[PDB]
Structures are given as C-alpha cells and as structure tokens.
Design a protein around this ligand. Sequence first.
Ligand SMILES: [Zn+2]
Ligand SMILES: [Zn+2]
Lengths: 56, 118, 75, 50, 147, 107, 116, 98
Amino acid sequence: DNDEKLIIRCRVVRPKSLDAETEAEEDHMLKKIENTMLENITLRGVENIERVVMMK
Amino acid sequence: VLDENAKKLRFEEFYPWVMEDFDGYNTWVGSYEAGNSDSYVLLSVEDDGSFTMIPADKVYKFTARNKYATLTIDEAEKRMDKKSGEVPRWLMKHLDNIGTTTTRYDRTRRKLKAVADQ
Amino acid sequence: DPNEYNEFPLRAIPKEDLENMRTHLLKFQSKKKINPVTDFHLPVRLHRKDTRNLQFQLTRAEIVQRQKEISEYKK
Amino acid sequence: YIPYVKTIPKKTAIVGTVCHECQVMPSMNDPNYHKIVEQRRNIVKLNNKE
Amino acid sequence: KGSRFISTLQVKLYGREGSSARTIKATLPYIKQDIPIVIIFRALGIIPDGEILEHICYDVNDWQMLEMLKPCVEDGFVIQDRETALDFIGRRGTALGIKKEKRIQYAKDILQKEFLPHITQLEGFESRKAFFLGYMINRLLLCALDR
Amino acid sequence: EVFDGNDIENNETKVYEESLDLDLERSNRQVWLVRLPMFLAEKWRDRNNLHGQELGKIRINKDGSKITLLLNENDNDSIPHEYDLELTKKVVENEYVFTEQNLKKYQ
Amino acid sequence: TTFRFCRDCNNMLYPREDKENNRLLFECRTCSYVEEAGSPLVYRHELITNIGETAGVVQDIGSDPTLPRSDRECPKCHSRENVFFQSQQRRKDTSMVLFFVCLSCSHIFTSDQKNK
Amino acid sequence: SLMSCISVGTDPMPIITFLSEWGMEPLEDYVPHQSPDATRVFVNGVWHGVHRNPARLMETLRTLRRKGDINPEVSMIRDIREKELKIFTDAGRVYRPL
Ligand SMILES: [Zn+2]
Ligand SMILES: [Zn+2]
C-alpha cells in the first residue's frame, strides 16, 4: 500500500512438456486470460449486485 | 441504350494492363484511374534544354502481384470456416516449408535449374 | 529584370507523330524504389491480358525454355 | 500451370520518367488577371438548362 | 438524378465491450452475407494492410484506434490479393448464374454500380470508394471509443 | 486484336513482324507532370491544335526554388501572360510514362 | 503501443521470440522480414483514458465564433484572451474540467486544481 | 414558422468545378500521412477532396453567395473541430433569413 503506484505482475508457468506451436499464440493466450481476469473475477460480493448506497 | 464512350472504356479496360519481366520476379497489374485521367499534361525535356508539350491520355495505377506466395480462394475459404478457433499466426511460414503455395519466380527458377543440371 | 535566370523555349510536339499513338501515365504503388531500367531483369513485356488465375501462368522465361525443348522434341 | 491465358499484345515504349509535379496558377499581379476570376464566377452563374 | 432508387450500406461492429475479438463487417447489396471490411478494401485495389489502416485513421499516433482495428486485419489475413478477394465476394452473390468464371466480374459490377452509388457509378473510381468507406469506418470507431 | 496466350507454339514469329518487348531505351528522359487550369487545359489539349508552334517559355531562377511560365502574345489578350509554376513535389518517384500503339499483323 | 509496420510490403508486423538470443524480434507474417524491437511493450489496454480531451485543436481554433471567450491568464505568455471548452470525451464518467487555448501561443492548459 | 422556407435544390456540378479550380486537391492523390491538417470537403454528402487553406476558401464561398454568384439556398458548414467543410445543395432543407 505504501507504494506510490499500485501494480500487479503476473507470469504464466509452462509445463514440463514443450509446446512449439503455442509460442505463436503465447501472447494471445495472455490477452485472453487477462480479459477473463478483468470480467470473470469476483473479488467480493454477491453476483448481480451492481452498486450499494447507504441511507439513513 | 448505353453511352458510347463508357462502352469503349469498358471493352478497352476489360483486360487490365500487365507488366511482367523475363524471369517473373516482378509482376505488376495496372488499374485505370478516372479522377485525373484527362486533367494532366506532360512536358518532356529535350536534349538541348528545351521543353516539349504532350497531352496526357490516361493514368494507370500498378500494384505488385504474387510476391509472397498468396494462397488460393479455395484454400483461403477453407481456413476462414470454423476448422479451428483462429488461423495460426505463422501459417504462411509453415506451408512455405512443405513446398506448397510457391511463387512464379521460384516456380520458374527451379524449372530452369532442373534443365541446367542436365 | 536582370538576367539572373535560365529561360528555355517551349514548343509543341508535332501532331504528325501523335496520331495512332497514346501516351499514358504509369504509377508504381509501393513504398520502395522501383526502376525497370536496372531493377527488372530484361527483357520485359507490357501487354494486355486477362488476370484470371494469375498464379499458374507460364513465365516468359518458361515459354522460351519450353520452346527450346519443343523444338528439340519435334526435331 | 495453365496452357491458355489469352493475352493481347501491343507495341509499348517508356518515353520518360516523371521528376517534378507542378501546378500552374496565374499570377495575381498579371494585367490580364481578374478576368479569370470573372470567368470562374461565370461558371456558377451560368444556367445552361432552360 | 438518374434512377431514384435507394441502396443502404451498413457497417457493423460485432461483439461487445467484454469480448476478446471485435471485428467490423460491412453489408453489401445482393451479397446475403456480412463481409469483413479488409476484404472489401482489398477488392477495391488496396492489398497492403498498412495502406488500409492509413485509409481509416488519419493520425499515426492514434494507437487506440489502431488497436481496435488489429482484429480486422487478422480476420482477413488469408486473403491478400485483389483477384482472390473479388472471387470471395462473387461466390456470396445471390445470382447463381455465374458458374465459376464470371464470379469475379459479377462482383466487380456490384462494387462499381451498386456499392455507394451516390459517389459515382462509372468505372475507374475505386480510390474514391475506398476513401469514403474508410471515413464511415473511422466515424464508427470514434463512436465506439467514446470520442 | 485478340491473340493466343502462353504461345508455346511460337506463333508470334510470323503473326507479328515487330518485337513485343516494350522499348526500354527512352526511359532516361526527364518529364514534368503539370496540372493545368480549366481555361488553359481547354485550349492546349485540343487535337485541332498543337502544330508545333512555340506556346511560350519557361524561366527558372539561377538559384532555383521559383519557376514561372511566360506565354506568347497569341492568347488574344484574353488570359494572363504570366504564370507561377508551383512545384508541389520536388522529388517524384515511381511515376513513368509509356506509349501504346498497334503492331503489324502481317508476317 | 507504437504499432510497427513491415518495410518490404508495408504489412503489419507481429512480435516473435528467438531463443538463440532470448531477445525480441518483429517479423512479418507474409514476406519473411525481421526487425529488432525497440521497446519491451507490445500491448496496452486503457480502462480509464485521458486521450482525446483536447481533440480538435487546430491553428485556427480562435476563428470559431461559437467558442466562448475568457479572461484567464495564460501561464506561458501572460495574456488574457483565450477560448475554453470542456473535455471531448462523451463517456458519462469524466469531470467538468475546462481546457483553455491561448490565441497568442496556442498553449493548452487546464483549470484543474486537484491533480493537474 | 412564418419566415421559414424550403429549398428547391440546384445542380451541384458547377460548385464542384468551382472548388477544383480554387485548390480542392483531388482525392486520388490525398496521402493522410503527408498532410495531417487538410480539411475534408463534402458536397451533398460526397467527399470530393481536401483543402490546405479552408479559411480562405470559406471566405470566397461566403462572399460569392452573399453577392449573388452562388444560389442563396446553398448551405455551407465549416466544422473547425472536425476539420470538415460540408456544402449542401439538395432540395428539402428548411432555412430562414437572418
Ligand atoms: Zn512484409
Ligand atoms: Zn498564451
């Protein structure tokens, strides 16, 4: 929190077997998971709950 | 009824200009341009410092053809269909090694070398 | 004005050579330098032809080679 | 390969290379100037249709 | 003046904001199918991908618009020649009279006399059609980018 | 002027009596592409004219950067006699001029 | 993102990894041309963007009669005449910060006092 | 309204020729990357070309219409922000005097 800028760094780990064909789409796969990491991640709360406002 | 000028242009431009070298290394196809076909004029510089006047007739735009082994309509259509989620990023390189989808320049060089060897 | 310039005459081309002759403009659409005088492999041909299947048509070099073997085959 | 292409041969020759592109514009100080402007104005003024 | 008929051209941005690939497809008369814009641009005589993008975006530093255009060039990657693009258009046409050889010419007429007719309908005006098409796509992207 | 295609039979040797390769000899010739105004282009592109008469002169400053055209007095004092040739592109590339005429069909 | 384009055919270049040097190369998917990358950034997605706030500024912006005039001080030439307009972004999440264009130096500044 | 009128429309060809003679660069040689300041010129929704000095061009067009060289019903709009110059000559446009 004390850091001036809030940054998250993520790295995908490849399996023991080497996939020569996935290198072409390696960056594309990252573009896929990041998009799903922006949408399909529920940090906290109940689904279908857009916003909550406090009233007295 | 069709305007005479257009019909002549259509018949004249039915087959576009094609410029090919001896070895097929360069293949350019010309396309007619009508925006400024008749609004241009040429000035040819003589070998004595003088200028010569020649009216301009037509303007042709030439684009290179078959320089990097383009695929065919049937091959292109097969890939577009849902045979796979997305086309491979290096599909062109992969098929280059297999030997399929060669170029006219390479297709002619190999045949010429196939004769010089004997 | 002072003669601090170069002035050359401008004369029209004779019309006797403009008949049965069409002068068009050729524009190579590319970002690099294209010069058929040096870049291309002579001889070169500029004709009118159909562009259908412009990927499996015999190159001018091929026909010359095919003509040589055809003459040898016929002989 | 294909055995027929149906070409149309013609006699052609390259008779020059373009080096300069120019645009001729009448001098604004020319004595005969302000007549082209009137001619240009007449272009829109003209009403050929009857 | 001349025919008094109306032909509508639609450019659609498929996919939503949460999609990983949003491509732009254009609707042409007498084609029955939505064609990618890149194919149309190639059918108009602009094969290079760099030239096509230059027709859409008029600023070299507007990477945001280019990033949204990258899927389009990827979609039409397997078609990279004018003749190939024209044949692709012809096959989709709803004529079924062209067997195998008049398809390219049939599509040529559609792109000439029935595609954006309000500019012109005479042969030799592909440059104007391509530039106007880019303007429509550019405006579409500006709205999609909240510009 | 329809003719065979690939021509593996070598039929052009007798059908045509002239070389079919474009003459790449006059290409080393500087040419200025000039767009003319409507009033000037209407009288210079007419085929009922252009008999070889001197239509004017071109004057280039010794240091360059400024060109001007001076027409003769044959315009009938109806159009300007001086024009400023503006170089819209000092360097022009990938542009060429080619001619076109028919070939001899006999022998 | 600084999109890079091919040099031989003007096609769009794509990033590729070479294990012989563990470096970054840009290669063409059609003509087999390579070019060494200059920056390690290849993709950039901006959820909250400030690009386009001053879109439409030209050398003759002051000639527009509709644009309002103001008496604010330009902090680069000490002038009082200028035309101001709000952000051009149409998203309903942007603040009402003004953007001022000076008719003497074409310098663009902002009235923001929160972040600037 | 009382002072509103509807245009009857005229031929746009004379205006197109006039624009070309006054520096409207044709669209067949317009390179966006070599002139990222030109104003697009539209006539009846048709992109005819671009101009390098829109301010001078608009002044000439406005003066001609006011003096009576161009039909008054012709509408000219210069979108400075969008760098566009639209000229409308088709019929059916509602206008009023000011
Ligand atoms: Zn390339
Ligand atoms: Zn200032």
